[PDB]
Amino acid sequence: GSSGSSGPPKFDPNEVKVVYLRCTGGEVGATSALAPKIGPLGLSPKKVGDDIAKATGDWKGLRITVKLTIQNRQAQIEVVPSASALSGPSSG
């Protein structure tokens, strides 16, 4: 005997996804809360945390949006100029 599964898909290194988070710029203050967050991930909270702090050094203390993209165990940091309805990957 046999039966279908029709289960959902799974993550993949090929495709790429971006994650947005709202927080204060250059926010060193912390009690090792990112430890358990990136614990299972692999990377380190210090390296990643310092990356954002340094980048947001020119505008430390101001509220800004940062886009973090994870690809091939790699993280990217970039500061957006403004926030607006940005939805539409397809052409035009």
**DSSP states of 33-72 as a string?**
-SHHHHTTT-S-HHHHHHHHHHHTTTTTTSEEEEEEEEET
Could you count the other beta carbons within 10 Å of the beta carbon of residue 79?
14
Q: Which amino acid is at 22?
A: R
Tokens 């990643």 -> residue: 48
Cα distances (angstroms) measured from residue 30 to each of 27, 33, 45, 83, 90: 8, 7, 11, 26, 39
- Three-class SS of residue 18? strand
Dihedral sign from CA coordinates of 80, 19, 21, 74: negative
Those residues with Cβ within 8 angstroms of residue 45's Cβ, 6 or more apart along the chain or in another chain: 32, 34, 35, 37, 38
Query: Which residue segments constitute the domains of the chain, with CATH numbers given?
Result: 1-92 (3.30.1550.10)
Structure-token pair, residue 14? 């090929």
